[PDB]
Design a protein around this ligand. Structure first.
Ligand SMILES: [K+]
Ligand SMILES: [K+]
Ligand SMILES: [K+]
Ligand SMILES: [K+]
Ligand SMILES: [K+]
Ligand SMILES: [K+]
Ligand SMILES: [K+]
Ligand SMILES: [K+]
Ligand SMILES: [K+]
Ligand SMILES: [K+]
Ligand SMILES: [K+]
Ligand SMILES: [K+]
Ligand SMILES: [K+]
Ligand SMILES: [K+]
Ligand SMILES: [K+]
Ligand SMILES: [Mg+2]
Ligand SMILES: [Mg+2]
Ligand SMILES: [Mg+2]
Ligand SMILES: [Mg+2]
Ligand SMILES: [Mg+2]
Ligand SMILES: [Mg+2]
Ligand SMILES: [Mg+2]
Ligand SMILES: [Mg+2]
Ligand SMILES: [Mg+2]
Ligand SMILES: [Mg+2]
Ligand SMILES: [Mg+2]
Ligand SMILES: [Mg+2]
Ligand SMILES: [Mg+2]
Ligand SMILES: [Mg+2]
Ligand SMILES: [Mg+2]
Ligand SMILES: [Mg+2]
Ligand SMILES: [Mg+2]
Ligand SMILES: [Mg+2]
Ligand SMILES: [Mg+2]
Ligand SMILES: [Mg+2]
Ligand SMILES: [Mg+2]
Ligand SMILES: [Mg+2]
Ligand SMILES: [Mg+2]
Ligand SMILES: [Mg+2]
Ligand SMILES: [Mg+2]
Ligand SMILES: [Mg+2]
Ligand SMILES: [Mg+2]
Ligand SMILES: [Mg+2]
Ligand SMILES: [Mg+2]
Ligand SMILES: [Mg+2]
Ligand SMILES: [Mg+2]
Ligand SMILES: [Mg+2]
Ligand SMILES: [Mg+2]
Ligand SMILES: [Mg+2]
Ligand SMILES: [Mg+2]
Ligand SMILES: [Mg+2]
Ligand SMILES: [Mg+2]
Ligand SMILES: [Mg+2]
Ligand SMILES: [Mg+2]
Ligand SMILES: [Mg+2]
Ligand SMILES: [Mg+2]
Ligand SMILES: [Mg+2]
Ligand SMILES: [Mg+2]
Ligand SMILES: [Mg+2]
Ligand SMILES: [Mg+2]
Ligand SMILES: [Mg+2]
Ligand SMILES: [Mg+2]
Lengths: 117, 201, 144, 64
RNA sequence: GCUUGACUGCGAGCGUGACGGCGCGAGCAGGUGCGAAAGCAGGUCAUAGUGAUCCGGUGGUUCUGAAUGGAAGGGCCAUC
RNA sequence: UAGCGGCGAGCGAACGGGGAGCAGCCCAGAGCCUGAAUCAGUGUGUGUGUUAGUGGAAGCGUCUGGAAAGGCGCGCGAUACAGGGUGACAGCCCCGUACACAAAAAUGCACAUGCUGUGAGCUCGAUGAGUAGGGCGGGACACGUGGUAUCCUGUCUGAAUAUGGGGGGACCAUCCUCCAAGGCUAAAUACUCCUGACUGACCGAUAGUGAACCAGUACCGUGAGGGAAAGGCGAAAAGAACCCCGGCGAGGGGAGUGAAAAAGAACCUGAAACCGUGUACGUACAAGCAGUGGGAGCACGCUUAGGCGUGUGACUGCGUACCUUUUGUAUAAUGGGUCAGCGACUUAUAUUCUGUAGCAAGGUUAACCGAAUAGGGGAGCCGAAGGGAAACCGAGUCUUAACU
């Protein structure tokens, strides 16, 4: 029962090389190099599903800070004020409102300031 | 336990142990596998590094050439080299305990009765050693793929069945577990049933 | 019941280990041998009873005893064997004929093991105190 | 082929009813005058092979 | 001063060792010494003073004894 | 197992049992008697095989197609549906196959009866000497000199010879058993350079022979010796008339053949590395494992016209390959230029444990017989009893004079 490897080996190599499309040089052409590139791409993608959540929160906070300071209050006081006012709107939504509805954002700041006063 | 004869319409009495027992799949499986293992010829070989034709000269010196170290041109790493674990001829036959063999046959025969695949007749024969006669007889009986078991194997029936690939004609002593399962129907003469009864008990 | 509807019993056919076929198997690379040393090697490992060079147990302990040739030609008969002979007389030859003892056995002893429930004459065998009581209680007799 | 008994082990161990092994004690061959009678008396009866050593003995005596 | 307990067979139980081993031990049987007796004595205030197995030697022995009776050799106990 | 054994590593019987097969004779010598038994060489009939051969059943229509053996329909043979071939897969087209037959000549074999040599039967007698045995040295016996029987003999010796002699594992006695120093002998057993037939959970061109091919060749070596690579057009050569560019080239474009010519002989399929042409997008102020998360712009598709898809990826967060070996490696430690193909826990037997199946105080057979995967075969093996070094005793036994 001699087994030739060619058909299965080809399919495995092609599966990896397909995942390496777009990579530079040997990384999209050469199995040995492409395999390492694909594993590393997977490692980074795993890491960066966690980092994405950090990076977006960082961005939302920076924008809330800018919008809050245009309305005469720091980010840190603003968040404290909203919590004392029992407002549960999260940072993704606050940052969205900061950009797209300036008047509504001002109303949130006034709510925060009233809770602090 | 009784089996009605199709031609005669009598009632042949048989033991519950042989023809009425439960199907033991695990036991039957072992015996069927053993039977197929018994059919293997097991004739093959490859050449180890000892058996490949060539010199025992070391291909190049141990050190200094910048090549991987080599010892034999017959190394299994090398093209044209030996097979690492070269096959030899093997005996693939298994032991089947006598009682497990007999137990498997009783399970099979009992299951053929439950599935209405065992057909008992008083007699089964042909006038002349003519395939056309047996082919017509099986057409009359609504049989196609059939194992025919006789008490004594007729020469006319043997010769008539030989060129029909769907049909096989055996004596009762020449039953085997795979053949009872493989054919769609099993026709037994009354005399064959008694010999099989006596054989298995 | 067809050749493609038979299965083995659950648990009856465990798959063999295959070493050195990659990470996922759990036996890749070193094949369960660990790292280096004599035991990792092809043909590697020390002989039976070897303890690293310390005088091994089977040499630091003394030899004792001798083997008796008489023991090899002496058998024990159970009470349950007494009924297995043909014709109700138990002696060496009838025990040999019944395949109870080997043909080269020259001496035999009936012991209190199992039961005797029939009258048996025992001739030319030793019998234990307990076996004698059991044989005599079943209406048997013992002849030296 | 058949496993070969370690013949030196067969001269030093005998299998008991529950599958342990009896052996003769060491230290009662010679240099006996200096040994207390108590010590020698306790070395006379046969002893059982310890748990740690059973694996070694069993390997040596496959037909015990 | 009188003595041979520096006893023989055993040993509940325990300590210490990977193991081989080593250690402590009331008490039981037999026979003993000392003392008036209770009692004590199985070496020495204790902890070093030691060498496995093999091979063989010596003495003993209700064991074995290659046709049988013996014997040789072997075993077992003591010891080198 | 018993034993042997620096009692180490290891070596390893026999007795006895079950089978296959089976067969007994002659000389060491005269007599009587005829040449009776039977083995060889040389004949010649009788079969029976071998070396060429002979006959050997039964199918058409229609659909797809380059082609039908395929599909569909309706028939027929089968002691033949083994197998091979034929323009795709054929019981019925071809070659076969089952079955039935055949030899002028040579020849194996088996019996038959000649001739030639060979002599059986019977009674009486005989019964293997430099031998057995020994001393010395060595070797062989499972047995290593050991308490070492037995066998062989290089060396030195040396019996009794049937009222005798050998052996029974030191040795002696007793008893039993056999007759050395002369020889022949079928079968069961071993093997395959070679011939025929058939088979394979054997390989399928880096495999399988080293060798599918003009291979023990080319080639290497003074020589012994070493020793490759290399298979496939198509159903059929129908292997491309003729024309055109070119050197009366190479190579190509047409034409033609063909089902197909990116089947055109550098020929089935035609992967990958590697190298190009074309198009989209990015890229000449920008620093590092080259990705990943975010992300504009552009191009091209789709179209609830909201968006989506595909390619690209400005800019930006994070981010020092893999294997190995290590306390620890981005490591400036190891290994890999890349791709494709191959390349490493197997096999046999024994043994123990687990799972599972059978049968159960029983379980199971080996060789072998059997045409038999059956059935027979229970020789054996394991288990149902242990204790003791052992004799031995035995649900106990050993220890000890004897056990609380
Ligand atoms: K048939
Ligand atoms: K392991
Ligand atoms: K006392
Ligand atoms: K057709
Ligand atoms: K055909
Ligand atoms: K001589
Ligand atoms: K004699
Ligand atoms: K070669
Ligand atoms: K080759
Ligand atoms: K980036
Ligand atoms: K290192
Ligand atoms: K280095
Ligand atoms: K196993
Ligand atoms: K099992
Ligand atoms: K006891
Ligand atoms: Mg293949
Ligand atoms: Mg590519
Ligand atoms: Mg090869
Ligand atoms: Mg059988
Ligand atoms: Mg692991
Ligand atoms: Mg390693
Ligand atoms: Mg290490
Ligand atoms: Mg290790
Ligand atoms: Mg090696
Ligand atoms: Mg028997
Ligand atoms: Mg001693
Ligand atoms: Mg105790
Ligand atoms: Mg020695
Ligand atoms: Mg004797
Ligand atoms: Mg003798
Ligand atoms: Mg002695
Ligand atoms: Mg024909
Ligand atoms: Mg084709
Ligand atoms: Mg003679
Ligand atoms: Mg002699
Ligand atoms: Mg001599
Ligand atoms: Mg001699
Ligand atoms: Mg000599
Ligand atoms: Mg010698
Ligand atoms: Mg010796
Ligand atoms: Mg003698
Ligand atoms: Mg001789
Ligand atoms: Mg080749
Ligand atoms: Mg190919
Ligand atoms: Mg030359
Ligand atoms: Mg062709
Ligand atoms: Mg041209
Ligand atoms: Mg083709
Ligand atoms: Mg091609
Ligand atoms: Mg630009
Ligand atoms: Mg600048
Ligand atoms: Mg720029
Ligand atoms: Mg740069
Ligand atoms: Mg993204
Ligand atoms: Mg960075
Ligand atoms: Mg280091
Ligand atoms: Mg690091
Ligand atoms: Mg560097
Ligand atoms: Mg490096
Ligand atoms: Mg290194
Ligand atoms: Mg390198
Ligand atoms: Mg016992």
């Amino acid at each position: 029962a001699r087994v030739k490897r060619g058909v299965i080996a080809r399919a495995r190599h092609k599966k990896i090389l397909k995942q390496a499309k777009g990579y530079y040089g040997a990384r999209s052409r050469v199995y040995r190099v492409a395999f390492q590139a694909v594993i590393k791409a997977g490692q980074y993608a795993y890491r960066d599903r966690r980092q994405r959540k950090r990076q977006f929160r960082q961005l939302w906070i920076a924008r809330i800070n800018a919008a809050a300071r245009q309305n005469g209050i720091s980010y840190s006081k603003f968040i404290n004020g909203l919590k004392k006012a029992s407002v549960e709107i999260d940072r993704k939504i606050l940052a969205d409102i900061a950009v797209f509805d300036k008047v509504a954002f001002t109303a949130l700041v006034e709510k925060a300031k009233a809770a602090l006063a | 336990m009784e089996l009605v004869l199709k031609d005669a319409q009598s009632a042949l009495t048989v033991s519950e142990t042989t023809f009425g027992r439960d199907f033991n799949e695990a036991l039957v499986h072992q015996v069927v596998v053993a039977y197929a293992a018994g059919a293997r010829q097991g004739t093959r070989a490859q050449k180890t590094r000892a058996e490949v034709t060539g010199s025992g000269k070391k291909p190049w010196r141990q050190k200094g050439t910048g090549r991987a170290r080599s010892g034999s041109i017959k190394s299994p790493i090398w093209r044209s080299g030996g097979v690492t674990f070269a096959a030899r001829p093997q005996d693939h036959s298994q032991k089947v305990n006598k009682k497990m063999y007999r137990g498997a046959l009783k399970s099979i025969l009992s299951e053929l009765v439950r599935q209405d695949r065992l057909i008992v007749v008083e007699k089964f024969s042909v006038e002349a050693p003519k395939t056309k006669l047996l082919a017509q007889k099986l057409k009359d009986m609504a049989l196609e793929d059939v194992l025919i078991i006789t008490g004594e194997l007729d020469e006319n029936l043997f010769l008539a069945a030989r060129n029909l690939h769907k049909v096989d004609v055996r004596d009762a002593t020449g039953i085997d577990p795979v053949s009872l399962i493989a054919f769609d129907k099993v026709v037994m003469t009354a005399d064959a049933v008694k010999q099989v009864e006596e054989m298995l008990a | 019941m067809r050749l493609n509807t038979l299965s083995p019993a659950e648990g009856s056919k465990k798959a063999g280990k295959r070493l050195g076929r990659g990470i996922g198997s759990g036996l890749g690379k070193t094949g369960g041998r660990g790292h280096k040393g004599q035991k990792s090697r092809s043909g590697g490992g020390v002989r039976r009873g070897f303890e690293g060079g310390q005088m091994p147990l089977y040499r630091r302990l003394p030899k004792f005893g001798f083997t008796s040739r008489k023991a090899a030609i002496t058998a024990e008969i159970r009470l349950s064997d007494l009924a297995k002979v043909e014709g109700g007389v138990v002696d060496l030859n009838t025990l040999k004929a019944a395949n109870i003892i080997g043909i080269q056995i020259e001496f035999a002893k009936v012991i209190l093991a199992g039961e005797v429930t029939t009258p048996v004459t025992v001739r030319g065998l030793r019998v234990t105190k307990g076996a004698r009581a059991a044989i005599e209680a079943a209406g048997g007799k013992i002849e030296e | 082929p058949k496993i070969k008994t370690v013949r030196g082990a067969a001269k030093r161990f005998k299998k008991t009813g529950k599958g342990g092994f009896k052996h003769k004690h060491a230290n009662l061959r010679h240099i006996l005058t200096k040994k207390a009678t108590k010590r020698k008396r306790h070395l006379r009866p046969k002893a059982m092979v310890s748990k740690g050593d059973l694996g070694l003995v069993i390997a040596c005596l496959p037909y015990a």
